[PDB]
Amino acid sequence: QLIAVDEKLDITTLTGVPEEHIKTRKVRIFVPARNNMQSGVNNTKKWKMEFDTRERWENPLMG
Amino acid sequence: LHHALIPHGKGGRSSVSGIVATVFGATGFLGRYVVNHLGRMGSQVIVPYRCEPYDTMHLRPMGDLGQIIFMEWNGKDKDSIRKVVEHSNVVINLVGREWETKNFDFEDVFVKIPHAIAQVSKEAGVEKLIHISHLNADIKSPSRYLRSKAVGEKEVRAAFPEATIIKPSDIFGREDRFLNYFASMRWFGGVPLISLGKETVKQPVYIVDVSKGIINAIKDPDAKGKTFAFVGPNRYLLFDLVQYIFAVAYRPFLPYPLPHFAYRWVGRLFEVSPFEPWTTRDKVERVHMSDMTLPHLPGLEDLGIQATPLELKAIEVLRRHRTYRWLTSEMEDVKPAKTVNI
Amino acid sequence: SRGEYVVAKLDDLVNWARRSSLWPMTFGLACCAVEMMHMAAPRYDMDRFGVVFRASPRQSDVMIVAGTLTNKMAPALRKVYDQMPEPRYVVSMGSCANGGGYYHYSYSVVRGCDRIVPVDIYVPGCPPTAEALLYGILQLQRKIKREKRLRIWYRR
Amino acid sequence: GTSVKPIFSRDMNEAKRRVRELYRAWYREVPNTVHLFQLDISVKQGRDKVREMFMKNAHVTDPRVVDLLVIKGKMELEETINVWKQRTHIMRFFHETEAPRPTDFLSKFYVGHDP
Amino acid sequence: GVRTSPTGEKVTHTGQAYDDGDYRRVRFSDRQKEVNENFAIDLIAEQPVSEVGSRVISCDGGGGALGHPRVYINLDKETKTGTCGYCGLQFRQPHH
Amino acid sequence: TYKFVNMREPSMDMKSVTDRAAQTLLWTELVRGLGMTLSYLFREPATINYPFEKGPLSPRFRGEHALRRYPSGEERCIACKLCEAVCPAQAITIEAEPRADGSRRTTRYDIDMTKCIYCGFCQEACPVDAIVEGPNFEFSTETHEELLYNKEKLLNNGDKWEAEIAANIQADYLYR
Amino acid sequence: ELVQVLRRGLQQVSGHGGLRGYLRVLFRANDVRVGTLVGEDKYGNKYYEDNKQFFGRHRWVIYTTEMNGRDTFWDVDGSMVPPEWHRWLHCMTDDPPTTKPPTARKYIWTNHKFNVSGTPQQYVPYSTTRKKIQEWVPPSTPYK
Amino acid sequence: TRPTIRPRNDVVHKQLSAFGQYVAEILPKYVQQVQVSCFNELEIFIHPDGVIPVLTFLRDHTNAQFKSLADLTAVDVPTRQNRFEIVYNLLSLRFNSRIRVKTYTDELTPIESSVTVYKAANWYEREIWDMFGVFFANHPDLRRILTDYGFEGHPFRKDFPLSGYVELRYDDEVKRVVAEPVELAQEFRKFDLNSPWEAFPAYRQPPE
Amino acid sequence: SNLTLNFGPQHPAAHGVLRLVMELSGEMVRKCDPHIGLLHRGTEKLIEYKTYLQALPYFDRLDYVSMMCNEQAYSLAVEKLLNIQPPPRAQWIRVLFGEITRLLNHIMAVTTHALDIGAMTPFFWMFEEREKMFEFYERVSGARMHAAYIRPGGVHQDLPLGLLDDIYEFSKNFSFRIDELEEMLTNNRIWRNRTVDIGVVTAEDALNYGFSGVMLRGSGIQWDLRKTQPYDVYDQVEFDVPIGSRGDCYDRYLCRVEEMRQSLRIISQCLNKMPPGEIKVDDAKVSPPKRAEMKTSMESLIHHFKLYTEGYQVPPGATYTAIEAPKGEFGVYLVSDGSSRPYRCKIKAPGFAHLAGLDKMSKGHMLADVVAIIGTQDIVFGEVDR
Ligand SMILES: COC1=C(OC)C(=O)C(C/C=C(\C)CC/C=C(\C)CC/C=C(/C)CC/C=C(/C)CC/C=C(/C)CC/C=C(\C)CC/C=C(\C)CC/C=C(/C)CC/C=C(/C)CCC=C(C)C)=C(C)C1=O
Ligand SMILES: CCCCCCCCCCCCCCCCC[C@@H](O)O[C@H](CO[C@H](O)CCCCCCCCCCCCCCC)COP(=O)(O)OCC[N+](C)(C)C
Ligand SMILES: CCCCCCCCCCCCCCCCC[C@@H](O)O[C@H](CO[C@H](O)CCCCCCCCCCCCCCC)COP(=O)(O)OCC[N+](C)(C)C
Ligand SMILES: NC(=O)C1=CN([C@@H]2O[C@H](COP(=O)(O)OP(=O)(O)OC[C@H]3O[C@@H](n4cnc5c(N)ncnc54)[C@H](OP(=O)(O)O)[C@@H]3O)[C@@H](O)[C@H]2O)C=CC1
Ligand code: SF4
Ligand code: SF4
Ligand code: SF4
Ligand SMILES: [Zn+2]
Known part of the structure; x- marks a missing residue:
């Protein structure tokens, strides 16, 4: 009926994410800034969560 | 460091390791493992092949798109060797035939070809040259194989002074001739052993260990002029080694002594075949010769590798030789063989 | 010389025998296999080229990977490739089998069958027309014709 | 309070009991798996791998999360018993083809920009 | 109008060419390098200049619906020719 | 409105019963099937003699991609990147910069033929008829790398197939 | 009804240039049909049509025995038809280039090439973009 | 207004509204909300505990005989406290109508399985568990259906990456197919297509 | 203990990539356990990552046997969410090509089923007709099977000037091909022995299990979404709706043949009644303008x-829109959040x-009975796995 759990919520073990992408990632929670090229404000209404940028390299074929 | 050769990525398939390797003899037993380990890291591999291109098909999935380039070459032609190593910053030499053929004697395979490769690589500006010889390579050896190995090693050292030289000893693996060769003897029904194999000591080494040793020697700056001995952790008598081989395969063991002259005569008879010989006088000499001990040379443990014991990776090779009855038998129910260690 | 002529003639004969009778395995995964069916249809009639489907891998010469190769299916494709006796050839059909295609970025799709098996001929399209796959099969026949096994053995 | 409802276990003790049942089942199954799948590992290797996978998430203190983990463990055990898994799926627990990533600061600094 | 690098490699219209020490040139060994020999810049350079008696002209690339979107070019500047944004054709107003 | 497909009963008069017994004992319908197969045996087969004959196609057929030019020789592409934005498979990769004469042109135009789904959206989105899907379909390769087209390969394709691509567009541009 | 068929067969035999030509066409194209010569290629291909046959078999090509550099007596392929005859042969139009020639352009290839896969003329992909980041070049003069 | 605009149907709207009121009156213990969309589709938002009763009623009541379960799926909305939204689509052949039932759940709260009401749900619920991680309480046989054997995570989740975490390749040294961390030769290119100007004034939300 | 066998993926009668685990006593079947997901490509997540136009191509692929019907179902959903309406000519073209697609799917379903039963000749005879219908597809769109012709605003291009005549020529002759198929199959006693009283499903069970299409109509249930x-x-x-009486494989086969005949009837009606006008909604904010106006306006x-x-x-x-696709009720539950990319797109396929x-x-x-039952369900695994 009601077990009254007194623990902080934590679902890290059920999501299937490798621990490298849990203990090392740093997420950013923000309202995106308005694109200064335009005057419309419709893209500054909702909050967004993103991740830190990682390495991007040039693949030897086709660049 | 030639910016286009700066390492990038997490070391995976699409990653760049900044290595450009020309692997001579990549279509053999050790060559496939070396190419696989090179392609795992994202290295660029140039495979010079002389065989049918079909016979190189198994090397295609080993690398990413464009990371494995196949080129035709001729051993006796220097221009082909120049063409295949003109852009590589490391050259690995794995060319070698266990038997003598009508067009390529042991001198051609172990002395002339390695010397030409080393000379052309030095002239082309190749930074690193890995050469493979035998642990038992001696100039006084009764085997033409090992005498040629020693002479070719000396020539390679003379032509490429900063060449890393590796001396393995009877590599065993899935495609090896060493484990299979003993297993193959059961068809005759009697295992002929010179002096019952009671005066021959063997120190076989795992194939993955040798490939990892080559890879770690490529990336080790202080392994330029060094010579390495790649041997296993345990030493076995030949009799006990063959006993363990037949026990793992679950086959009846019937070993009998054969005089040296009779074994040499039998080896000669097999040698006459147009196709590759099951055994040859040279093979008889090499397989009944104790493995040399060289405590003054570095080994796998000096490259960060713990040698894999035979008892761990022997079932993966000999399970194929079991019958249907014993096909499902486990690994730890064979009571490993006795090791004469020091 | 004399041995060179004999090995060249024998190699030509064996290459012709292997080229004229190609037995693909009945193995289709997705949309492209429908086009494969249309090759067996009367209009194109692959049978007249010596190409006849056979079910068991042990009696097959060529694998045509016609469709998407998912992660769940890759072990089965590799297994039925390993059970084909040599000589064997692989023909990759369509964008999905070539490089992932429309599902290249999916979490459950292998980006090209060349990660699992070596491939001889890549046939592009989504799906390739029955004529495109017929052209691919004829190109595979030409490639088989070019191969030189006995000559290479003789010069060993 | 919190108006939460359990899946199977009311408290921590029932969850631990189910965990021990799952551990017994996996421990029993390991030798049969080694025989059927023709694995090259020993029974001890499989059993200590099972122990390691169990201990990988031994920090959980929520009975509901423990119940869900036990359910997933039962799913994997049923997949292994019925030979729905193949040899590759079983060996994917061992990561035999992956280079060991370094854990110290200096090697990570040498290798790349990833912390 | 193709050039040749010091290593004997053709230079593409985008100007790309591998350095002397670049290992990627090994991908062209026993093969060839794909280069289009009809360089567009020289081809559009040889086109003559159209003389029109208007301050504003219109260009659609030729062919009507088979050309580019129709644009208008101002020809009031005397020391310069009006150039189409899409086609690259040049127009001018009569002088001298 | 509906009809029944298997809701008929057979008449039980002695003539019909004897006819059914004759059918059972003498295999009349099996002979009818054999006759149908025999009739198909004596017809002309619908097989064409490929590669000496080809199946019919249409001007709207989508095949190998190509990049076209203006009659003056200038490239039509202006690097608007609409084809790249519309591609459902993300198979187009474009990099551009001002040319030496100031034109807005690409420095990289890559199409992954193994990612492409050959949908033709790219030639729909293009505003200058720069990128097209040509008529060719016999371009199988022996390696994966040969199906990764760069700008030079696509321009060569355009130069090679323009004589027919222009005719195909002329025969269908009024439907677009 | 039967002698007429045999006479048609003998007429087909005679219409290819005798027994040698009949055997050549039989062993090269696996078909001994005779039709009106619509045209001849620049490379030697001969294009025939016969409207009495059903759709798909009313237009065919006899390929040349020698293309640009390779012998093509036996190994022919469908990539050797030039684009104009490619458009005609695939029933994309009712008119041959001998009646409706294609528009002439200076940049169009004057020599068609077949599929060059597996040959030293195969296309090798590469990046067409210049270098992104330029490095610093240290001076060659010693600093002390 | 005539040629290009979809025409409205007022009669079906009235019928669906009346039937929604009827259902809400019959089952006040579970029904939280009723809606009729402008293209004449009827939705009933209920409490998670009422999945078995409501459906049973909608399957068995004489005035509402929805004997066919067309679909059963879940929707992931991370910003809600109850993450997953379970949707049942039912079809009534007797009255030629369609109805929708919606409920909610989170990562850890189970939902009663409706295999007793509809056999068709048997696989559908499995699919949900495979791709969203929603556990169904009394499912006779609940396991992965679409994903690979031993596949970790639930792909149809907003936080799950498009290309996953592992990719497969054949390794010759071990002679089998192995899974390794994903490494794309070309990264998926993210496009920001949203316009900065409001498109539909009718759906504007209050700025609080 | 029962013997356990793997049926598929690499099997002739597995119909693609289906792994079926069956427990057999002898050749009796004790339990079938289908294992799917060998063709699951994560279509729905990818659709979440594309625009509404970019996601259209995915729909043809879900069921690669009747591609045009899939696009139409999706198009109807997007049009309903947009509150717009295609022109009459677009709708008539849609229905005509939907009937042609139904013909294609039925020919494929009936012939493959016969092939699994062992009757090889019928498949060869009807795939020439399938090739002609592929020619129609390619003429109207440029691709033989993945046309992407039907758009969420109508169709992409108008018909070529000589297409209706060729469609009439094909339709006036298809009946004799159907008759030859029926001659070879319908009254054959081997076929009846193989299909009669095999896989009998009752009406109540068929309704509760979620069956649709012929699998309903074969049990006597009078239901069709086009009516x-x-x-x-x-x-x-x-047109008429064929209704079975026994619920076995034979009744469903007869229903499919009669459905082909009725679709010929509908094709005749569509050919006679095609109206003039435009082909996509005259709203440039939904459907692209003509190429002639894009370059001048x-x-x-x-x-x-x-x-x-x-x-x-x-x-x-959010909407759930379903059409009567040749394999059954094909539906899409589409959820939009005001963006240009769909928030959620759940695909309901009757094969599931x-x-x-x-x-x-x-x-x-028996085992061969199970092969027949797999054949009679008209299963394609692209739509099953998605
Ligand atoms: C819609 O959803 C889907 C499906 O749903 C239906 C699917 O199904 C599906 C899967 C579909 C694919 C797998 C493609 C499958 C294609 C179709 C299903 C069928 C197409 C072709 C069929 C197989 C029809 C075949 C029937 C015909 C009759 C073909 C002919 C059959 C042959 C086998 C008969 C002849 C056999 C061969 C010719 C071999 C015989 C040759 C001999 C053995 C050799 C000669 C014998 C010698 C040994 C003689 C030796 C003696 C010597 C002395 C002679 C002289 C020698 C000396 C040197 C002189 C997919 C993907 C799918 O998506
Ligand atoms: C046990 C008794 C038998 C012993 C072995 C003999 C078996 C019979 C040999 C059969 C001979 C026929 C083989 C080739 C037929 C000629 C066809 C010709 O076209 O082949 C060309 C070239 O063929 C080869 O050059 C000939 C192969 C045979 C070479 C001679 C072998 C002699 C047999 C010797 C056996 C024993 C030797 C003695 C030592 C023991 C290439 O053709 P291809 O391009 O593909 O097809 C064109 C396709 N088109 C029509 C669509 C355009
Ligand atoms: C006692 C009498 C018993 C008779 C029994 C009844 C009849 C049995 C005969 C069986 C008939 C077989 C079919 C014959 C069709 C003829 C095919 C021929 O026209 O094609 C030629 C095939 O030529 C072959 O040489 C003929 C092979 C036919 C005999 C094989 C039948 C197998 C039984 C005996 C095998 C011994 C073969 C010895 C010759 C190689 C063309 O090939 P080729 O001229 O090359 O061109 C390629 C080489 N080029 C490129 C340099 C020009
Ligand atoms: N295998 C062992 O037990 C250990 C071997 N090592 C040494 O390591 C080297 C490789 O080992 P391994 O892989 O087992 O031997 P392999 O026989 O398996 O590999 C031989 C390779 O060398 C090529 N090759 C052989 N001869 C020539 C030639 N005349 N011209 C050109 N290429 C040739 C082969 O090409 P192709 O196949 O196309 O003919 C092949 O690619 C050898 O030099 C061997 O002596 C020494 C200790 C023992
Ligand atoms: S390449 Fe295209 S047609 Fe072929 S299986 Fe993939 S999606 Fe289907
Ligand atoms: S045809 Fe379609 S998938 Fe191919 S490049 Fe053009 S838009 Fe992209
Ligand atoms: S090909 Fe056309 S659409 Fe693509 S960038 Fe060039 S001009 Fe724009
Ligand atoms: Zn212009």
């Missing part, structure tokens, strides 16, 4: 740019429910 909930112009054509160029870069926005809302009910359908039967 009860018509969508495009199906209320302006007349500023508004047209702006709208073409914004349609092919960003795409049209769809007002927020049919394959789920296969285990109940194969109770007390």
